[model samples]
Target: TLQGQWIKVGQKGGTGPGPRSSHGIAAVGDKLYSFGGELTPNKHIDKDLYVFDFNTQTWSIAQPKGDAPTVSCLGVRMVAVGTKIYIFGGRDENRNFENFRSYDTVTSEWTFLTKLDEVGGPEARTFHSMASDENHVYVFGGVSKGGTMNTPTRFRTIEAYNIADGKWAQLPDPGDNFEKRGGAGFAVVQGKIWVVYGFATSDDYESNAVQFYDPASKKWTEVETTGAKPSARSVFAHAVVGKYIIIFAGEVWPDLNGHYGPGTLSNEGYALDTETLVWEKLGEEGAPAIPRGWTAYTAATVDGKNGLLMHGGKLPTNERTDDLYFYAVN
Candidate 1:
């Protein structure tokens, strides 16, 4: 990660807190924003948001107003658009609610956008997937209800929502080729939506297929390119940086329960050249410790260079930790 320089912002020991996984991170200016995830004692979930000023090297908590997304499961996804941060789905033991929450970065006030075409909203889903054209949010495949993501019984379909207009539309399913569910890496570049790996009904990554969605045409197509290709996975260290799609710490395959289900986290990191389709490994120093799914993170500039900020998630052993770490390409 030191190709440029990899610095772990939140250390193992410091003034703030210790390591935890699957927490969410957002950034503006020289500051990085972070919030809730699972942890002991405070297992109830967290809504307190904070910011790390890269210049000052200080972290401060922001008091959030309005209804914040319930902090049950972190990687409660959020993306910066205008002066607002939009948050989507996350999971709790019981269910994953599809409530799209928005936070005014400046005002620090929150509001949940719950109406999809006034026809209500999408189903309660989690361990799902999302990507942004900035103008539009393209949500690719994910598990179906009752957690049967694979199997012919569970279907594969892509859903999209316009961030500006807030309208929802469903795209044709990936047919039978791609994985049934999405825990894969996603990126939108050069007018194409690309994805790496996720579990399917087959419950394996051997079918690791790279696919792309064209906003102009609205379809998913397989990608073929030279150089290293990312291994199969659903969720991993993911973030969109320039034309580089960086994915780290996701499993190479899935577990078999005889059907579509969640898989373990793998310890591989791959940075792909989106335009060329070439992939490379994130070096040892550049590696993030927690190798698991749904670690709330994304790429942003801290100081003067591109960096990554990460938060909590489920440990392979199924434990939820409350640590926060952020780093950038070196």
Candidate 2:
């Protein structure tokens, strides 16, 4: 059982990262780095970096040294390798970027790892799911701008970046009827990557798919889930703790015509037991009231206690938020 409560970690007022959404976060020890989010919808891009200290419960702007990316992006993918955090694909106002960069927490330095490769690499996309193991960082489904609003294209490709060798390899696409989509949740556990539900296309329909990919055998398996499951949604946040995967707060697209529009925001939370393929709701009595999209959710330890470090996100009213919360699930 996931016995937990919501503990607000920091304040949005005074000194902080301010209100943001569509950002990405990765944890290296007690410090979590948040970068490349939006202050306004598809505008006012945030290019500066900020770090949250769990020990002091404070947020500070990180003045990293390096050639930073020219544009601040939403839907960027970030993963921590040792003390080095790698940042990849993201979308800006004009287009999507596939440049690879890294930030080192110890040295407070940023390094541009690789430039976008047109001939060999994943297609430039946004809102994709990413995870990593010891040697490689894995990237999966995201949407690429297509012909028109009605015909936005999604991706079903899989690729990995080798941290040690600085190489990119496109893995064999798991063609087991998996749809191309964006805003899916992913976590690497016991040598496998598990992908949760995400929007299938610009039509904005969500998938109930709970699939896992094994990099060793190059195969995809859909896990059968029982008990209460989450409603169809995209751009939600999820964290893996022990044998459980906890998901929360995403937007379900409207059901009006074929013109996809934002529908409802779900503040509802659920936990899925990976071993048994069972889903259960997180305790409702003490949950956060604000519904959000792809907010900063990272695994962390405070005072020798393991829990989730959640931060700023866009609210239900389409406004950005700076409120921070913690879920102690042990």
Candidate 3:
């Protein structure tokens, strides 16, 4: 009922993409935006885009009615610049695309913005984070299929998706000892980006390295922070609400049975106030939202109040949850 508190918005809508983590999120006005993610049960990822309007508290699932983009992937994890949603690199049923894709919310259709092989954007990528500067979308680190079947090559290369010019350019590196793996982060303030904890070519998920990007300067700097920071997490929810960078529920490395099991982190939440450069922890407060990991969480404003909206994500047993929850800031 208050800021920094959460209340379950509604019951589970439907069985959605399983608890596959690390998907792109966007908030266009009052509607929450989501698209394709790692699916549960078998790790099959979804390619469809989704929308949820607090105005009505309902979910709308939209996929093409015709041949569609590809049978491999519905869409890549992307962001919204204005009403046009931008999709980054994602794997189709067989291979990952070489370019970026943009979806027009106005027409509810998809269009390829650029081709990776045709010369724009970066190389093949997935499990990366993306944000927008109202005019351009910032592409960050992600790994490539390790040339094998399930292995991936990682990097921290920063690229800019200039929507105005329909082109891509590499951004200057952060210079510090920060690299991108699968984890959570978001864009905040005046075109600044937050790269939170994740792997750096390691299979571990304990990243304390928080690298922030300043668009004006084309550089990266660690956001000053103290106190209990989030335990290293990857594919967790990350966003800026008010002046805080919120990190909510994600699956940390599971037990070392050499396979997935319990004892792995599931339902923890944390936040770092960029304004104060301090960290705070949050759980399912004021609401009984399931405290599980592998979910997508982000900052959204509802009725002029800043808030957090937690939605579709993976659960511990390799399952996807479809419940929606939100809380106010003021």
Candidate 4:
């Protein structure tokens, strides 16, 4: 259960991070780190990285040495553990692909991930779902160049990467016969990984279903949610808070203008209680500053208070946003 108040804590400090969409953000302690996404106009990929400090409410760009990912990425996933952020499969401007990379916020460096084996693991794709534990980063369904909106590829397989030893292996299918999707709201909740509402394909990209994978039993279960639910959306900011999985802002449809667009955007907030598997609409009285989607965001707890921080997203009018917003969960 979350209260209905929206807070617009604007971006602070000198020249904040630029406007971008499909980027990744993660919280390390009180600081939120963001990296890699698509820029506007021609959908150019961006490689710059920035961090927002909750202590001072300021943003700063990060310049790191050592081996970094050479290509700018969009539709990537960054999972932070301790002081390190793990980046995985995303497409470059030329439509090329890389498996993984890691960034150290504490040391201010990047370590590109290399596969020790010649085979196994996930294929090169974009718009997939990712979640992480202490030692492993789990990846699920995404878009494959070879795969069409009409055909589904290895999207059914779930891949796991071991942070300790650079190795990749495919996990068994959870056997729920789940449909392949991209840009789904994903989170690790109640000892399982859950994927909620994503683009099914070009024709029916928006979905309103919730399904989860149990690693312990190696099975997939469809959650039976009650109450008024949110519409189908994808590539939204989502995280686990207490017993609820909170999702905010995402794209509704895509434009075939070649550059790609969310077509429609949303500012709605919804929470799914893992305990009861019920959906609750947030902000009956108050809401976010604007209704936009495809923003880079993360779930974070500052000073023991849990909230969500968002920055930059695509708007419905084929424009990219450059503002920052936060929502406090009560």
lDDT per residue as tens, model 2, 1-330: 677766777543334668877777888888778887767666637677788777776778887588676667887878887988888778687775647788889988889877653556556667788888889888888766442344557777677888889888887786748878788877877778888888885345888888888878888887889888887777777777887878878866643532122346778788888888999988776577866765767666665667666777777677788777777775
* Candidate 1 Cα errors over 4 Å, as ranges: 1-3, 11-19, 40-44, 96-98, 115-120, 144-155, 204-207, 253-265, 286-293, 312-327
TM-score of every model versus the real structure: 0.79, 0.91, 0.83, 0.90
Could you tell me how far off, in angstroms, the CA of residue 10 lies in candidate 2 after the best superposition?
2.3
Error of 1 at 122 (Å): 2.3
Best candidate according to lDDT: 2
Worst 10 residues of 3 by lDDT: 66-75
Tens digits of per-residue lDDT for model 4, 256-301 = 6623755767878888888788889877444654667767777777
Q: Which regions of candidate 3 deviate over 4 angstroms?
A: 11-22, 63-68, 71-75, 96-98, 117-120, 146-151, 202-205, 254-263, 287-291
Per-model lDDT: 0.60, 0.75, 0.63, 0.73
Ranking under TM-score, best-scoring first?
2, 4, 3, 1
Q: List the residue pairs that clash in candidate 2.
A: none
- Enumerate clash totals for all models, in the order shown: 24, 0, 17, 3
Return whichever of 3 and 4 wins on TM-score.
4
1 or 2: which has the higher lDDT? 2
lDDT of 3 by residue, 159-204 (tens): 7877778778888866546665654465655457777776566555
